[PDB]
Amino acid sequence: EQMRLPSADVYRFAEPDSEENIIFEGIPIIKAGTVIKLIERLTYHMYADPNFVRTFLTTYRSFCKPQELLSLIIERFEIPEPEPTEADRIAIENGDQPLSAELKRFRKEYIQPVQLRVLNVCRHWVEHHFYDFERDAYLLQRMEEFIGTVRGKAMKKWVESITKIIQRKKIARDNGPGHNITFQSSPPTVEWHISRPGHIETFDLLTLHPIEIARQLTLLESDLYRAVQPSELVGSVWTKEDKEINSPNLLKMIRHTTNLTLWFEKCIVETENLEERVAVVSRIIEILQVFQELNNFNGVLEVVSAMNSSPVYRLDHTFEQIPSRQKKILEEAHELSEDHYKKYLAKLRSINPPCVPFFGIYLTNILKTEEGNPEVLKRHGKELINFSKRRKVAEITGEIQQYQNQPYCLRVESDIKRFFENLNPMGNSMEKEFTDYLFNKSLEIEPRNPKPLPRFPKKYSYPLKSPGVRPSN
């Protein structure tokens, strides 16, 4: 009795499971499938599958376009009803209403179930991935068209649910971001050093207070971390040609990291006087120290990256003068990264909020997953989409997400914020050219051992003494 399901002449989502169309790894977990089998199982009539819905909608762009998805789920929804029996045909021939017994049960046990799973996909799509519709107005047109042409008593509650979500997201992106954290305790006083409040023209590494540099960079990096959406990381989309559209928050995070790291390097090697340069390196290790007190691991490893860089790491005469206890701070920070990040991961998972995780490790691990797993599995001459590959990426993005909920009890200083948002150490140079300049500047200020060490004039007119990293109170 196969003929209860609709035929392949009329419906593409009812062909049998085979080893040529679906591989699996309780609700079953799919390893690989054709897109039709993935859509079918996304909307399967016998059970709901919230883990697969979530993971599919996070990752589908690596195997299917949004417009193709919408077409496929609409096609999924439009199930053909079976032909009436000879007796039902006789009934309507006689002028009567037919009994319709199988038609009624097929509606109950197939059509309605599938259709409510399609509307659930729509709801999850608009609720958690509204960006696809912000990025494509015609996709939003199609969605609203499809949703307003869904008729029926059982469907209309969903149509409401979806329409109301679509209203909220349109209203929210019209309004923009707002202030949505009341401080749950009193934040500490903003710290100031040489630069006076408002006097932004004097803002620099040594002239702002090291505590406040570290706090304001932590607030900034916290917001950047929190703004990354999972799909920005799937498929390596931030390395592809449409990176600026598909990965905006991700690329903001990456470019911030690049600009802060290179700015630290620039501050160091452009201070040619040894003693001033020691005070600069020492101030950066103080900022590191405050990053670690805040559990901004992102900022700790940006300082580490700068201290391990080509231009900076070779500056033996500078590091000789750094106090032993600041050397120990810097050594411990480096040891976070050793052995595949062992101590980092242990500390991450044991602290209480708030923190900023190191973002670079997630990129590294996602790239390894992307490069170490095939896009397709071949079975019997057919290519199936490797869905396990996407699930493994989605699980890494879910680790990201678990820490995106950790606001700091720190007050924003708008001008210091803007100073760090507007860091541009490279200028109009390309990265490679800029880092070649940095390395050449390093060789100038501390030549390779056979050549002697010149002295260089001082460049800072204010005192080099730090105020330290203990706050007021």
Ligand SMILES: Cc1c([C@@H](C)Nc2nc3c(c(=O)n2C2CC4(COC4)C2)CNCC3)cccc1C(F)(F)F
């Ligand atoms: C501690 C320190 C650093 C840290 C960030 N780098 C560092 N530290 C350590 C290890 C290591 O391999 N590295 C560098 C060497 C590389 C490979 O080429 C760079 C990673 C190994 N285990 C013990 C700690 C940088 C500059 C000046 C110092 C200071 F002056 F304090 F000693």
